[PDB]
Amino acid sequence: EPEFQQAYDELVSAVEDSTLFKEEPQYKKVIPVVSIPERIIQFRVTWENDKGEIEVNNGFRVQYNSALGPYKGGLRFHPTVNLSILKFLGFEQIFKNALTGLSMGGGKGGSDFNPKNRSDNEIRRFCVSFMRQLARYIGPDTDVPAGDIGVGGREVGFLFGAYKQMRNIRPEATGYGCVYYVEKMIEKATNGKETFKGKRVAISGSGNVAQYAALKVIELGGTVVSLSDSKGSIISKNGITADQVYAIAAAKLKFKSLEEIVADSVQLFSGDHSVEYLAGVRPWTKVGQVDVALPSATQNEVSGEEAKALVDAGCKFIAEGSNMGSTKEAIEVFEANRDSNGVWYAPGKAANCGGVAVSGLETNEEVDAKLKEIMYTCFENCYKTAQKYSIELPSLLKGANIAGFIKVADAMFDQGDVF
Amino acid sequence: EPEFQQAYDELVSAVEDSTLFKEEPQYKKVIPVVSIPERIIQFRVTWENDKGEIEVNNGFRVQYNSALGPYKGGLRFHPTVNLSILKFLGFEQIFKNALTGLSMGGGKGGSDFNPKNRSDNEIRRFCVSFMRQLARYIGPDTDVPAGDIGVGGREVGFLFGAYKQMRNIRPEATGYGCVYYVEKMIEKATNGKETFKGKRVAISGSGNVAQYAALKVIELGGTVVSLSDSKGSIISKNGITADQVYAIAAAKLKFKSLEEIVADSVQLFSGDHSVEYLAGVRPWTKVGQVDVALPSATQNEVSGEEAKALVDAGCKFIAEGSNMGSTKEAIEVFEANRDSNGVWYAPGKAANCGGVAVSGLETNEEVDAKLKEIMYTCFENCYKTAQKYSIELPSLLKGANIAGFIKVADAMFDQGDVF
Amino acid sequence: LPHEPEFQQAYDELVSAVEDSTLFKEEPQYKKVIPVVSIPERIIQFRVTWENDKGEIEVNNGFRVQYNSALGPYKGGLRFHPTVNLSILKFLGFEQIFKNALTGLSMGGGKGGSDFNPKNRSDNEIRRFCVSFMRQLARYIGPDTDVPAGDIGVGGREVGFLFGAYKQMRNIRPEATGYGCVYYVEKMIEKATNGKETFKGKRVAISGSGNVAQYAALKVIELGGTVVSLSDSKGSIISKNGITADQVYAIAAAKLKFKSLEEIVADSVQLFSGDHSVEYLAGVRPWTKVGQVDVALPSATQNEVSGEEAKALVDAGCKFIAEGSNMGSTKEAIEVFEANRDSNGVWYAPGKAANCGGVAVSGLEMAWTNEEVDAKLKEIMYTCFENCYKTAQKYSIEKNENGLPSLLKGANIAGFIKVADAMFDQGDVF
Amino acid sequence: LPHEPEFQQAYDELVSAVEDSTLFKEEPQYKKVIPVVSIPERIIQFRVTWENDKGEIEVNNGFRVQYNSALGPYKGGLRFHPTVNLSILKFLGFEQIFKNALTGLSMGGGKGGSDFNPKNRSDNEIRRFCVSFMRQLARYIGPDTDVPAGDIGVGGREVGFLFGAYKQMRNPEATGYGCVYYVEKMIEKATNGKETFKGKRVAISGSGNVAQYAALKVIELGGTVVSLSDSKGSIISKNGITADQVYAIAAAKLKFSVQLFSGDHSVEYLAGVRPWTKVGQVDVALPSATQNEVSGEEAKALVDAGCKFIAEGSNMGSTKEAIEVFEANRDSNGVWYAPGKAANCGGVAVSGLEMAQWTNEEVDAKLKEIMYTCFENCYKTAQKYSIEKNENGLPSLLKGANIAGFIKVADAMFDQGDVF
């Protein structure tokens, strides 16, 4: 289970490389307990396609930790889904929810069911079968699933219908929250002198996180210099416009390559705001001078090589929109140059918690303001916690890890789950 | 999951290399359905040792297939236990129970909890915690666990106490049944002329299966020429006596090496019935002329090399006491020389089903007779089924595999679990 | 099919109202819903055995029709009345689906009760029956599953007994409906006359004398109309100056004792003979016996306006009709009213839109002062009227038919569309 | 009260049979039971939504009538047939109460099913409906609560699908043989042992399970099966129908043969006609097709044809006028009528003994014993409470069976405080 093991190693090494276990050695007891999920449920999901042929998939619910509240997490319908990936995701979710400051436990679930190029009837039949097999283990006071990759309004509606028969404002949250967190990062690191205004921001990925992160970077006066997808990156020098982002969203809903989308809308991507697409390359090295980096595509998408490239490019802020976007080497690079070059790295579990925070809160202005405040409180928590337990700018990695760990561990001790 | 995958490959290739899918192609639908377990439950088991320190283990219940009846299977408390091994064991258990002719589904569970060198209080605390975490998913009409490696009368008593507070004749079965199956094998292959009388029988392992298999070989007039354990084998030429077997049982209850047991009881193992111990070697090559081979230790303990050695040694009957004791190459060797050299191989899922059959039936004479008849019916089933679907002595491997598959698949079709 | 005439009438009304529009042309997927929604999700009959004060065993039937849960938990009353059977409760729950839909509240459709006759029953017998009935029903209700409320035969006392039994086992209303109906007709008049006219100075013919009719008449008075009639199972009463509030309260107090209108005009000679005298016509409905009349509010029972009486009302100058009772107008009456809509400006509104005030206030009960609740009911009925109007216009087959739009088709289609969208989202229809 | 004609016929038959007796005089407490037991303890209607092979949505009604549990858990079949509604299932469950009572087994009364039509449906469609129906019904059944079994439209395949759905969620000759055994004891009593089924002309209607195995048992005992029928026509023979013809008819009716039906064993098919008038002189009549398949005219025709024994294989096979005819000629011409609730209880009795679970011989012997005990019970009970009290004649088996079942159910209901 390499992805989970990488996340576990990041959190553990961030906690041990601190005064936490020296100041309170009781926290030493928590590591082997919390890291083992409270419950995992695999189940066969048998359904019927439109051809009347039998289809079989695996469904999972990883209820990892409930110390802070009921298990909370998404459902992912995607062929890449297995116990290992969902273990990694739920493990991250524990501390992500901890850092949102809400009473939300950690969990994650889903299925290797592939809804792409599937009729609405086939999706409905799978949803019915999956919810019939899963409803035994969820509820509002037990386990709250939400939508994720492959589970949208349609899937949620069908799932809800099955659940009901049996028992007889999200899209921008993550990206906006990430950008608000980096807003507070810049504000703190420069004593209020600098903001996102006039900051070159290199973003990877083209999904929900990256899209709305770029939109908020634009709104705050930054210049979005890059996006990417599974096949290549796109780079601009004037900054990507909001109209280009909306077009990319509409086209990615059709599952179209960035190559094909800049081909199909030449006028929007070729005028004053033209963009260059390089296939098979990550944007980090291909953007020159850049101030902020927001990897918002997948895990391990920033190598140590690319981290050094970003540092040499004048990058002073990096925050993960995606889950565990930076490799171990990239994080080592960023942290090594923290006190010397002022390059500040923030892990995903703190930056991208906006989505799950908004889900926990579930008008547009009220929700946006509460998410803003939640991300600001999360940043202050990471900062002060890193300062309080600093062995030697404070490390936001260690800050976030220790903060989430401490909240979860205090809960677990109070409830006698660790002793 | 290599062990499960090996078992799956054995069953699948045995079924495809037959007229089954040609005579009834509907059975083609079952393979991808049955092989995915109906439900798997992982759960943290938190308990307290005598030192007041917190211990954590993983507990599993693999409810693989319930088409023939409620899930039925053992609980194994041993550090080697994980989802993969229990998947392999429950997958085998499906068809093993199918071949017992009883209405028993397939399942297997347990924990990596190591009860060795553990106080009765620590075992009790773990049992309480494990049953509290597992009772949610078992019952007499849902899932019946029984005892296995690491779960004995004491563990069962503690588990039962926890279950009761919450809801407010086995040892010889497997070996005796295996030997009865080989009795019918010899009787059929020689038109009643030959029995176990005067047959040199090479047995591996020294646990429950091997012990009682050797005792029944003795009782029927055979000569037990070998036993083994994790460190070495022991070989005799006059045949191992019942007293030596009882001594080895008493000593293995103390977790003592065969080396150390033949050291500690020189008089019993050095007189007329002396035995030679060779460390780090399997007995198959070191016994000379041998008629019957009963691997009763672990999976993949007979290589193709050792299979050819057995065939060259005049071995005409091989039957697995252990689960999947023969490697793919060994089975290929045995089956290749079946029609030419008359060497007959029987897979574990048919030979060692005696234990689970007796558990399904749950005086000594009545139980022994019913187990005898169940194994005889199992042999007749394997034989006639192999004959009915022979592409070209009939193959008992293909016989047993196709018989179990057909019973399970007919159940699954009747219940609409496959279509 | 079993003989379910009232349910079938309601079903035919809704179906024909939906088909006679561009709805199935604009979105043909809605074609699938009719045969699905019309079959109740669940019906529970159960024997209710209880004991009278003489120690003798009494037996009744109890029913719960949980019809549709697409918009929310089943919501509806419990009716303890000897006329109650599966057929009537099917009709009522079917109406309840769309009635709740038009309140704009997240309330499913349901209705239940028993043929138990609480008339001439001691409090102890009522308590014993409530205990037995609730012990037999509680397995199938809950705050997140099915919310029963009070209706005919189920009042504060019955609700108290039922709740006590439920609690042991599982371990303002009266004016809402009539006031809401009259508010709906207020918006009808206001819209049909471009704000020039209200209920002020309107002759309004009401049938029935129960809670619905009583408070409808009271609200007609308050707004300046003249209530020219009331009625009951035995006869009608007609006045020329309008029935007074004191007369309505007297009829309410006496109807609590199950007194005929003849009996009550005999018992209170002084109150019913002065300037505000009234003539009692036995065995007759008031529609033909009130002369020229502007508004008609049948608020007694189903099928209480015949086609003859509908034409009589039209000839009497009736320009507004809205059902206080469930399905008060016969199919022939509705045909008459709708035929005179575009020509004579005769506007008919079905019960499922007009009488939803009670269940709307009950839904707000699930979620205050008398004034606040009255305002919220006022708002709900106004939104219900606007919805019927705008929806009828949106799906009018007669293109830009600049006359009056059909409120029948409006209400039916609005409730249907909300329910069907819910059922599609949840996979109850596909 | 709703229009429930079949239920009302069954209720009226039982009530009038009980009142025309000394029962309410000797023990007037039973007067209290009639209005209680006749009201079902519970009825559950539910929508059953499923999907046909074209992917289109189909909707049906499913019912479970748990009528009376005084003697034990609700027991009865599931019927999948378009004619199925609340009224028919009320009628069937009401009959089932006393039918189970007369088996002497601790079995309550219940019946369920759906208007689902399995006729032109693929196994996939039948599976989808069975899954949907069982998902909607399982909440209200159980081994200690309510045990459904097979009936019209519910066979091995449907039962397999239903059981599979239930397992995922909660994690043949009996009737006809029993009917023939009952008529065996009828003849044995009416002729003081001199006559049996040997050499009796026996006219059977229907061609389903009941009629088929009734004809086979008549053959085994030496009788001559002179007719069969179905919803579309009748078949008549004069030499007697052979067992092979019955097996052929069974195989073909499971699928919904000139040589077998043209030799010595030739048969005449009369379309659109019931066999009662078209068999000439006949001794025993076994209506085994559907309810109300013997009109008063056909009953009088049977009596004039010398029929002295009539027993219902189907549920309530005789119309009220036919029963009046049979009972009127009882004391004079020795015409003996036995209602279905006593004769056709063999199926549910064997189902209850399988609930208790045997070889074919053991089950056949216990079914024989149960039917013999049922006949003796009807006889003795009719005699004990006979208002007539004329040993110059035969006692009413109708009143016998009705009063016996009523008494057992009512005593159970009294003991448990369900009546007082």
mmCIF file of N, CA and C in Angstrom, chain C residues 1-4 32 35-37 39-51 55-61 67-68 85-86 90 136 139-140 423 427-430, chain D residues 1-3 32 35-51 55-61 67-68 85-86 115 136 139-140 413 417-420:
data_model
loop_
_atom_site.group_PDB
_atom_site.id
_atom_site.type_symbol
_atom_site.label_atom_id
_atom_site.label_comp_id
_atom_site.label_asym_id
_atom_site.label_seq_id
_atom_site.Cartn_x
_atom_site.Cartn_y
_atom_site.Cartn_z
ATOM 1 N N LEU C 1 -59.675 -4.195 -11.155
ATOM 2 C CA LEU C 1 -59.572 -3.264 -10.038
ATOM 3 C C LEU C 1 -60.756 -3.385 -9.092
ATOM 4 N N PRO C 2 -60.509 -3.171 -7.801
ATOM 5 C CA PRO C 2 -61.620 -3.042 -6.852
ATOM 6 C C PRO C 2 -62.370 -1.744 -7.092
ATOM 7 N N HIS C 3 -63.613 -1.708 -6.622
ATOM 8 C CA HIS C 3 -64.447 -0.526 -6.825
ATOM 9 C C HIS C 3 -63.928 0.600 -5.943
ATOM 10 N N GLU C 4 -63.149 1.502 -6.539
ATOM 11 C CA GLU C 4 -62.585 2.661 -5.853
ATOM 12 C C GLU C 4 -63.004 3.908 -6.623
ATOM 13 N N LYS C 32 -43.993 8.452 -18.355
ATOM 14 C CA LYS C 32 -43.755 7.227 -17.598
ATOM 15 C C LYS C 32 -44.350 7.250 -16.193
ATOM 16 N N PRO C 35 -48.518 5.700 -14.361
ATOM 17 C CA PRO C 35 -48.841 4.369 -13.828
ATOM 18 C C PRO C 35 -48.038 3.998 -12.600
ATOM 19 N N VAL C 36 -46.977 4.737 -12.288
ATOM 20 C CA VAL C 36 -46.117 4.434 -11.149
ATOM 21 C C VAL C 36 -46.636 5.161 -9.915
ATOM 22 N N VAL C 37 -46.770 6.486 -10.021
ATOM 23 C CA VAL C 37 -47.155 7.297 -8.869
ATOM 24 C C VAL C 37 -48.543 6.913 -8.378
ATOM 25 N N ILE C 39 -49.940 4.085 -8.024
ATOM 26 C CA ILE C 39 -49.971 2.889 -7.187
ATOM 27 C C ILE C 39 -49.280 3.213 -5.865
ATOM 28 N N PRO C 40 -49.965 3.083 -4.726
ATOM 29 C CA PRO C 40 -49.383 3.533 -3.457
ATOM 30 C C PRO C 40 -48.136 2.744 -3.112
ATOM 31 N N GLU C 41 -47.136 3.451 -2.578
ATOM 32 C CA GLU C 41 -45.915 2.779 -2.157
ATOM 33 C C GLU C 41 -46.207 1.719 -1.112
ATOM 34 N N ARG C 42 -47.195 1.955 -0.251
ATOM 35 C CA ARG C 42 -47.477 0.976 0.787
ATOM 36 C C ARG C 42 -48.834 1.265 1.403
ATOM 37 N N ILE C 43 -49.587 0.205 1.666
ATOM 38 C CA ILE C 43 -50.827 0.289 2.421
ATOM 39 C C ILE C 43 -50.765 -0.758 3.517
ATOM 40 N N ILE C 44 -51.171 -0.375 4.723
ATOM 41 C CA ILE C 44 -51.163 -1.270 5.869
ATOM 42 C C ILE C 44 -52.564 -1.276 6.452
ATOM 43 N N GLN C 45 -53.269 -2.396 6.297
ATOM 44 C CA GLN C 45 -54.482 -2.663 7.053
ATOM 45 C C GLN C 45 -54.133 -3.491 8.276
ATOM 46 N N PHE C 46 -54.838 -3.236 9.373
ATOM 47 C CA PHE C 46 -54.629 -4.031 10.570
ATOM 48 C C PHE C 46 -55.893 -4.057 11.411
ATOM 49 N N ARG C 47 -56.163 -5.209 12.018
ATOM 50 C CA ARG C 47 -57.255 -5.299 12.973
ATOM 51 C C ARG C 47 -56.919 -4.485 14.216
ATOM 52 N N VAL C 48 -57.910 -3.771 14.740
ATOM 53 C CA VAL C 48 -57.781 -3.031 15.988
ATOM 54 C C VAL C 48 -58.859 -3.556 16.929
ATOM 55 N N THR C 49 -58.462 -4.374 17.903
ATOM 56 C CA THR C 49 -59.375 -4.896 18.913
ATOM 57 C C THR C 49 -59.207 -4.085 20.190
ATOM 58 N N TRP C 50 -60.319 -3.609 20.737
ATOM 59 C CA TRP C 50 -60.306 -2.817 21.953
ATOM 60 C C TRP C 50 -61.520 -3.210 22.787
ATOM 61 N N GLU C 51 -61.709 -2.536 23.915
ATOM 62 C CA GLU C 51 -62.684 -2.963 24.909
ATOM 63 C C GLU C 51 -63.538 -1.779 25.326
ATOM 64 N N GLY C 55 -66.939 -3.854 29.132
ATOM 65 C CA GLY C 55 -66.064 -5.005 29.074
ATOM 66 C C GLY C 55 -66.264 -5.907 27.879
ATOM 67 N N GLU C 56 -67.002 -5.461 26.864
ATOM 68 C CA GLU C 56 -67.218 -6.243 25.654
ATOM 69 C C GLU C 56 -66.151 -5.914 24.615
ATOM 70 N N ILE C 57 -65.822 -6.906 23.792
ATOM 71 C CA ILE C 57 -64.769 -6.748 22.793
ATOM 72 C C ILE C 57 -65.332 -6.054 21.559
ATOM 73 N N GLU C 58 -64.655 -4.998 21.118
ATOM 74 C CA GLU C 58 -64.989 -4.289 19.894
ATOM 75 C C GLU C 58 -63.846 -4.438 18.898
ATOM 76 N N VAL C 59 -64.189 -4.510 17.616
ATOM 77 C CA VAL C 59 -63.203 -4.703 16.560
ATOM 78 C C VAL C 59 -63.414 -3.654 15.475
ATOM 79 N N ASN C 60 -62.313 -3.072 15.001
ATOM 80 C CA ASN C 60 -62.325 -2.090 13.930
ATOM 81 C C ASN C 60 -61.162 -2.362 12.991
ATOM 82 N N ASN C 61 -61.171 -1.683 11.853
ATOM 83 C CA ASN C 61 -60.058 -1.717 10.921
ATOM 84 C C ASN C 61 -59.252 -0.433 11.043
ATOM 85 N N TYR C 67 -48.508 6.841 0.483
ATOM 86 C CA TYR C 67 -48.695 6.842 -0.962
ATOM 87 C C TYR C 67 -47.421 7.165 -1.725
ATOM 88 N N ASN C 68 -46.782 8.282 -1.395
ATOM 89 C CA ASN C 68 -45.616 8.742 -2.136
ATOM 90 C C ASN C 68 -44.685 9.491 -1.201
ATOM 91 N N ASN C 85 -62.617 3.625 4.846
ATOM 92 C CA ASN C 85 -62.171 2.340 4.329
ATOM 93 C C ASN C 85 -60.941 2.565 3.459
ATOM 94 N N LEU C 86 -60.417 1.470 2.903
ATOM 95 C CA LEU C 86 -59.209 1.562 2.092
ATOM 96 C C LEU C 86 -59.427 2.438 0.866
ATOM 97 N N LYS C 90 -57.301 5.701 0.076
ATOM 98 C CA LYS C 90 -56.519 5.754 -1.156
ATOM 99 C C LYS C 90 -56.779 7.056 -1.893
ATOM 100 N N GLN C 136 -50.889 -1.016 17.081
ATOM 101 C CA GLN C 136 -50.891 -1.723 15.809
ATOM 102 C C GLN C 136 -50.249 -0.916 14.683
ATOM 103 N N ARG C 139 -45.340 0.471 14.391
ATOM 104 C CA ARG C 139 -44.279 -0.196 13.639
ATOM 105 C C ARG C 139 -43.959 0.488 12.311
ATOM 106 N N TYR C 140 -44.884 1.283 11.761
ATOM 107 C CA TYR C 140 -44.746 1.817 10.410
ATOM 108 C C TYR C 140 -44.753 3.345 10.361
ATOM 109 N N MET C 423 -39.212 11.829 -8.277
ATOM 110 C CA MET C 423 -39.155 10.389 -8.525
ATOM 111 C C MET C 423 -38.068 10.036 -9.534
ATOM 112 N N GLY C 427 -34.695 7.673 -8.933
ATOM 113 C CA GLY C 427 -34.831 6.387 -9.584
ATOM 114 C C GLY C 427 -36.120 5.645 -9.316
ATOM 115 N N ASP C 428 -37.134 6.300 -8.752
ATOM 116 C CA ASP C 428 -38.423 5.642 -8.603
ATOM 117 C C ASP C 428 -39.156 5.541 -9.934
ATOM 118 N N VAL C 429 -38.719 6.305 -10.937
ATOM 119 C CA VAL C 429 -39.214 6.229 -12.309
ATOM 120 C C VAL C 429 -38.012 6.346 -13.239
ATOM 121 N N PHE C 430 -38.048 5.625 -14.358
ATOM 122 C CA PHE C 430 -36.931 5.650 -15.300
ATOM 123 C C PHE C 430 -37.351 5.258 -16.712
ATOM 124 N N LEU D 1 -68.870 -1.974 3.596
ATOM 125 C CA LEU D 1 -67.866 -2.987 3.283
ATOM 126 C C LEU D 1 -67.599 -3.037 1.787
ATOM 127 N N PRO D 2 -66.323 -3.099 1.407
ATOM 128 C CA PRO D 2 -65.983 -3.171 -0.018
ATOM 129 C C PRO D 2 -66.582 -4.407 -0.672
ATOM 130 N N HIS D 3 -66.640 -4.373 -1.998
ATOM 131 C CA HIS D 3 -67.151 -5.509 -2.757
ATOM 132 C C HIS D 3 -66.069 -6.581 -2.778
ATOM 133 N N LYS D 32 -68.999 -14.439 19.951
ATOM 134 C CA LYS D 32 -68.124 -13.273 19.903
ATOM 135 C C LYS D 32 -67.052 -13.382 18.824
ATOM 136 N N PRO D 35 -67.038 -11.836 14.348
ATOM 137 C CA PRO D 35 -66.599 -10.524 13.841
ATOM 138 C C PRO D 35 -65.124 -10.244 14.052
ATOM 139 N N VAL D 36 -64.431 -11.026 14.879
ATOM 140 C CA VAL D 36 -63.023 -10.783 15.165
ATOM 141 C C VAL D 36 -62.162 -11.534 14.159
ATOM 142 N N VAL D 37 -62.333 -12.855 14.096
ATOM 143 C CA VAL D 37 -61.455 -13.686 13.278
ATOM 144 C C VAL D 37 -61.572 -13.327 11.802
ATOM 145 N N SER D 38 -62.757 -12.905 11.358
ATOM 146 C CA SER D 38 -62.979 -12.631 9.944
ATOM 147 C C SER D 38 -62.258 -11.380 9.467
ATOM 148 N N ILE D 39 -61.785 -10.541 10.379
ATOM 149 C CA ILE D 39 -61.024 -9.346 10.026
ATOM 150 C C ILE D 39 -59.543 -9.705 10.084
ATOM 151 N N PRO D 40 -58.792 -9.539 8.995
ATOM 152 C CA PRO D 40 -57.395 -9.986 8.993
ATOM 153 C C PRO D 40 -56.567 -9.211 10.002
ATOM 154 N N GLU D 41 -55.672 -9.930 10.682
ATOM 155 C CA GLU D 41 -54.788 -9.279 11.638
ATOM 156 C C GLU D 41 -53.935 -8.212 10.967
ATOM 157 N N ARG D 42 -53.568 -8.416 9.704
ATOM 158 C CA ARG D 42 -52.712 -7.452 9.031
ATOM 159 C C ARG D 42 -52.771 -7.688 7.532
ATOM 160 N N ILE D 43 -52.832 -6.601 6.769
ATOM 161 C CA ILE D 43 -52.686 -6.661 5.322
ATOM 162 C C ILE D 43 -51.654 -5.624 4.919
ATOM 163 N N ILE D 44 -50.748 -6.014 4.028
ATOM 164 C CA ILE D 44 -49.684 -5.146 3.550
ATOM 165 C C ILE D 44 -49.768 -5.130 2.034
ATOM 166 N N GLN D 45 -50.169 -3.990 1.471
ATOM 167 C CA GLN D 45 -50.004 -3.711 0.051
ATOM 168 C C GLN D 45 -48.718 -2.934 -0.166
ATOM 169 N N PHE D 46 -48.054 -3.204 -1.285
ATOM 170 C CA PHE D 46 -46.865 -2.438 -1.616
ATOM 171 C C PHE D 46 -46.666 -2.405 -3.122
ATOM 172 N N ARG D 47 -46.212 -1.260 -3.613
ATOM 173 C CA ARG D 47 -45.783 -1.162 -4.998
ATOM 174 C C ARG D 47 -44.515 -1.973 -5.216
ATOM 175 N N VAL D 48 -44.476 -2.692 -6.333
ATOM 176 C CA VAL D 48 -43.323 -3.477 -6.742
ATOM 177 C C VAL D 48 -42.896 -2.925 -8.093
ATOM 178 N N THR D 49 -41.806 -2.164 -8.104
ATOM 179 C CA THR D 49 -41.261 -1.586 -9.323
ATOM 180 C C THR D 49 -40.099 -2.438 -9.800
ATOM 181 N N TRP D 50 -40.140 -2.834 -11.068
ATOM 182 C CA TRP D 50 -39.091 -3.651 -11.653
ATOM 183 C C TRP D 50 -38.882 -3.208 -13.095
ATOM 184 N N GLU D 51 -38.008 -3.915 -13.803
ATOM 185 C CA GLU D 51 -37.551 -3.495 -15.119
ATOM 186 C C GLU D 51 -37.657 -4.669 -16.079
ATOM 187 N N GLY D 55 -35.682 -2.544 -20.741
ATOM 188 C CA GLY D 55 -35.281 -1.444 -19.891
ATOM 189 C C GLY D 55 -36.392 -0.498 -19.504
ATOM 190 N N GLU D 56 -37.644 -0.868 -19.749
ATOM 191 C CA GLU D 56 -38.792 -0.053 -19.390
ATOM 192 C C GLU D 56 -39.277 -0.428 -17.999
ATOM 193 N N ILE D 57 -39.843 0.553 -17.305
ATOM 194 C CA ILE D 57 -40.282 0.365 -15.928
ATOM 195 C C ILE D 57 -41.640 -0.321 -15.912
ATOM 196 N N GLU D 58 -41.752 -1.382 -15.121
ATOM 197 C CA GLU D 58 -43.011 -2.062 -14.868
ATOM 198 C C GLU D 58 -43.372 -1.902 -13.396
ATOM 199 N N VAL D 59 -44.666 -1.780 -13.120
ATOM 200 C CA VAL D 59 -45.156 -1.578 -11.765
ATOM 201 C C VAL D 59 -46.256 -2.591 -11.494
ATOM 202 N N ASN D 60 -46.205 -3.218 -10.319
ATOM 203 C CA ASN D 60 -47.212 -4.190 -9.922
ATOM 204 C C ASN D 60 -47.565 -3.967 -8.462
ATOM 205 N N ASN D 61 -48.629 -4.621 -8.018
ATOM 206 C CA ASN D 61 -48.999 -4.617 -6.614
ATOM 207 C C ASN D 61 -48.610 -5.941 -5.985
ATOM 208 N N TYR D 67 -53.687 -13.269 8.116
ATOM 209 C CA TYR D 67 -55.083 -13.211 8.535
ATOM 210 C C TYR D 67 -55.242 -13.572 10.005
ATOM 211 N N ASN D 68 -54.747 -14.740 10.398
ATOM 212 C CA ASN D 68 -54.934 -15.191 11.768
ATOM 213 C C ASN D 68 -53.756 -16.054 12.182
ATOM 214 N N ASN D 85 -55.767 -9.833 -6.323
ATOM 215 C CA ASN D 85 -56.014 -8.548 -5.691
ATOM 216 C C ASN D 85 -56.249 -8.790 -4.208
ATOM 217 N N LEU D 86 -56.537 -7.706 -3.486
ATOM 218 C CA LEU D 86 -56.759 -7.823 -2.049
ATOM 219 C C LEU D 86 -57.948 -8.727 -1.741
ATOM 220 N N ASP D 115 -50.148 -9.273 -8.611
ATOM 221 C CA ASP D 115 -50.797 -9.321 -9.912
ATOM 222 C C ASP D 115 -49.800 -9.443 -11.053
ATOM 223 N N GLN D 136 -39.405 -5.833 -1.165
ATOM 224 C CA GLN D 136 -40.493 -5.068 -0.580
ATOM 225 C C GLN D 136 -41.253 -5.847 0.485
ATOM 226 N N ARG D 139 -39.418 -7.435 4.901
ATOM 227 C CA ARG D 139 -39.613 -6.732 6.164
ATOM 228 C C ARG D 139 -40.756 -7.298 7.007
ATOM 229 N N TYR D 140 -41.688 -8.044 6.399
ATOM 230 C CA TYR D 140 -42.904 -8.498 7.066
ATOM 231 C C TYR D 140 -43.021 -10.020 7.108
ATOM 232 N N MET D 413 -57.918 -18.366 20.081
ATOM 233 C CA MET D 413 -58.090 -16.927 20.247
ATOM 234 C C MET D 413 -58.549 -16.577 21.658
ATOM 235 N N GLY D 417 -56.455 -14.289 24.752
ATOM 236 C CA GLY D 417 -57.043 -12.994 25.016
ATOM 237 C C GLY D 417 -57.337 -12.170 23.787
ATOM 238 N N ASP D 418 -57.286 -12.773 22.600
ATOM 239 C CA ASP D 418 -57.671 -12.069 21.386
ATOM 240 C C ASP D 418 -59.180 -11.924 21.265
ATOM 241 N N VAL D 419 -59.943 -12.694 22.039
ATOM 242 C CA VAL D 419 -61.393 -12.563 22.131
ATOM 243 C C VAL D 419 -61.769 -12.706 23.600
ATOM 244 N N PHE D 420 -62.768 -11.945 24.040
ATOM 245 C CA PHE D 420 -63.176 -11.997 25.441
ATOM 246 C C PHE D 420 -64.611 -11.525 25.690
#
